[PDB]
From a paper:
The FPC is a macromolecular cytoskeletal structure and is essential for the formation of the FP and cytokinesis. Here, we report by yeast two-hybrid, bioinformatics, functional and structural studies the characterization of a new FPC component and BILBO1 partner protein, BILBO2 (Tb927.6.3240). Further, we demonstrate that BILBO1 and BILBO2 share a homologous NTD and that both domains interact with FPC4. We show that BILBO2 interacts with the BILBO1 EF-hand domains via its C-terminal domain and with FPC4 via its N-terminal domain. Together with BILBO1, BILBO2 is the second bona fide FPC protein and is involved in a tripartite interaction with BILBO1 and FPC4.
The crystal structure was determined at 1.86 Å resolution by molecular replacement using the structure of BILBO1-NTD (6JSQ.pdb) as the search model. There are two copies of the heterodimer per asymmetric unit in the crystal. Both structures contain aa4-110 of BILBO2 and aa432-438 of FPC4, except aa26-27 that were missing in one BILBO2 molecule. The two structures of the complex are nearly identical, with a root-mean-square deviation (RMSD) of 0.46 Å for all aligned backbone atoms. These two structures of BILBO2-NTD are also very similar to our previously reported crystal structure of BILBO1-NTD, with RMSD values of 0.84 Å and 0.98 Å. Similar to the BILBO1-NTD structure, the C-terminal part of BILBO2-NTD (aa91-110) also forms a horseshoe-like loop that wraps around the first two β strands and the long α helix of the core structure. FPC4 is docked into the hydrophobic cleft between the C-terminal loop and the β sheet. Interestingly, despite the fact that we used aa394-444 of FPC4 to prepare the sample for crystallization, only residues L432-P438 were visible in the final structure, suggesting that the rest of FPC4 does not bind to BILBO2 and is thus disordered as predicted. This part of FPC4, particularly residues S435 and P436 in the centre of the stretch, makes extensive contacts with BILBO2 through multiple hydrogen bonds and many hydrophobic interactions. The crystal structure of the BILBO2-FPC4 protein complex also suggests that residues F63, F88, and W70 in the BILBO2-NTD are involved in the interaction with FPC4.
Author numbering:
A (entry chain B): 432 to 438
B (entry chain A): 4 to 110
Amino acid sequence: VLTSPVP
Amino acid sequence: GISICVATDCDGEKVNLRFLFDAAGPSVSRLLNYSTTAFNNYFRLKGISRAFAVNSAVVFNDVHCTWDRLERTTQLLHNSQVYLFQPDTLDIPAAIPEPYEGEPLLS
Ligand code: NA
Ligand code: NA
């Protein structure tokens, strides 16, 4: 569902 | 009870843990200390020798569909999803999975 964020 | 999920990168794969708190809830610093303990034990379980540490944290905002910097306890609502960045880590975006229970890792 959620994709991990990028900094 | 308030359920907060906390995810992070482990050798390229995303690992997600669920923590259950009283109706009042956690403070950010407490959530970060629990997460650090749990993921260090997880790394040890998987055979990873390096330590886990947080150098940045974000929380997913449902209303705007964005990741916000995690700075205040008022950001920790029920069913929140937190993501912890680490130092010395290549963090490539990938799907965050269903969580394991985080409490067995608290020791
Ligand atoms: Na939220
Ligand atoms: Na980083």
